[PDB]
């Protein structure tokens, strides 16, 4: 860790047939998350070859900023009711080397 922001990459895999529903739900996260204190990056992407695979690339000033993100309304709304849309969520935590 450090003065270096925390980078998070979330690889989210939709259940077969549910890519469009999951994209709708993930897109809702972006604007409010980008506005949050300490949010240095919050970008949504879709895999080039499998429509069911999405990637959120996030940078947070520190752990406290990330912890606050998970208590937000938008973040908890994503949690509320979407579990059947999901096959897998991988969360990678990482720091830039400079």
């Amino acid at each position: 860790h450090m003065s270096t922001p925390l980078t998070l990459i979330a690889t989210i895999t939709a259940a077969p047939g549910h890519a469009e529903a999951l994209e709708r739900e993930l897109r809702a996260l972006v604007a409010p998350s980008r506005a949050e204190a300490g949010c240095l990056q919050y970008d949504l992407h879709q895999d080039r070859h499998d429509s069911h695979l999405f990637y959120m690339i996030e940078q947070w000033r520190d752990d406290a900023a990330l912890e606050r993100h998970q208590n937000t309304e938008h973040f908890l709304r994503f949690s509320r009711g979407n579990e059947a849309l999901l096959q897998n969520v991988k969360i990678d935590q990482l720091y830039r080397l400079a």
Side-chain angles (χ1 to χ4, degrees):
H1 6 142
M2 304 274 276
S3 58
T4 307
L6 176 58
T7 296
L8 250 74
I9 302 161
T11 304
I12 307 201
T13 309
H18 298 276
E20 297 279 44
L22 178 59
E23 177 178 328
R24 179 167 55 237
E25 294 302 293
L26 293 171
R27 281 177 175 278
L29 290 169
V30 178
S33 296
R34 279 172 178 180
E36 290 180 60
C39 187
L40 299 181
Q41 179 181 11
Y42 197 99
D43 290 326
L44 181 59
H45 310 73
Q46 190 178 30
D47 196 84
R48 173 179 191 161
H49 298 296
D50 182 353
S51 63
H52 300 271
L53 269 166
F54 302 85
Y55 306 86
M56 198 75 78
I57 304 174
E58 310 176 20
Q59 293 185 65
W60 289 102
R61 219 181 266 292
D62 48 21
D63 281 352
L66 174 52
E67 261 69 306
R68 291 197 302 272
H69 172 64
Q70 297 174 73
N71 290 259
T72 60
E73 193 160 4
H74 57 281
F75 179 86
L76 293 175
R77 281 192 299 252
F78 174 81
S79 317
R80 286 167 56 189
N82 297 315
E83 180 170 15
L85 297 194
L86 298 169
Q87 188 186 110
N88 198 81
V89 182
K90 185 171 174 212
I91 301 296
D92 296 321
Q93 291 178 71
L94 42 142
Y95 290 113
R96 200 169 299 169
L97 305 183

